[PDB]
Amino acid sequence: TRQAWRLYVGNIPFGITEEAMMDFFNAQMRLGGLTQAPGNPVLAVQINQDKNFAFLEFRSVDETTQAMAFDGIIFQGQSLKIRRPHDYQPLPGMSENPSVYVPGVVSTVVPDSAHKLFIGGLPNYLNDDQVKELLTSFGPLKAFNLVKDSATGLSKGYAFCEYVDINVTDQAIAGLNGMQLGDKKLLVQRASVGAK
Ligand code: NA
Ligand code: NA
């Protein structure tokens, strides 16, 4: 099954070409020490421009798995969402999880948990990178996602995150909750408090 050689990439920059995406991933894999031989690990990229996602095709199962470590990497201001194809199943005795860490890359997977934060009231002109930088001021992030409209790509003005250090959570709340920005006022609280 070809699905062990392919990844979904969501939240791609508008107007990006398949070649630009391929060059980005091939370079990052090499610069990060993930590539396992001479030559390019990514063989092809198929972009769905209207739906805002791509699929990457890799030359090996192992390099496909390692590339999962790039989930959340910023590309032209956007956090790339890297995921397995929905019809992927690991073969027995194979780990589906990457074994290398990429410095500075913050996962987009923010599970509901004790210290998961909601940040509402963000100006909609801030991209994923700038909201991430706002939050990183308080301490390193374990995970982060800025919510966007799936049809237009515009920020919906709220995000979720998890700090590496659970104790930074209350520091970010103290520094950001109630902050006024024009007509908006930030609400920063554990996401469990106001989850619908
Ligand atoms: Na879309
Ligand atoms: Na988007």
Author numbering: 145 to 340
Quote the passages of the study that discuss this structure, keeping the authors' original sentences.
U2AF2 is a critical pre-mRNA splicing factor for the early stage of spliceosome assembly at the major class of 3′ splice sites. Two central RNA recognition motifs (RRM1 and RRM2) recognize a polypyrimidine consensus sequence (Py tract) composed primarily of uridines and at lower frequencies, cytidines. Structures of the U2AF2 RNA binding domain show an “open”, side-by-side conformation of the RRMs binds to uridine-rich Py tracts. Considering that the NDD-affected residues are located near the RNA interface of U2AF2 structures, here we investigated the hypothesis that disrupted U2AF2–RNA interactions could contribute to altered pre-mRNA splicing by the recurrent NDD-associated variants. De novo mutations affecting the pre-mRNA splicing factor U2AF2 are associated with developmental delays and intellectual disabilities, yet the molecular basis is unknown. To address this question, we determined the X-ray crystal structures of Arg149Trp- and Arg150His-substituted U2AF212L bound to Py tract oligonucleotides at 1.4 Å resolutions.
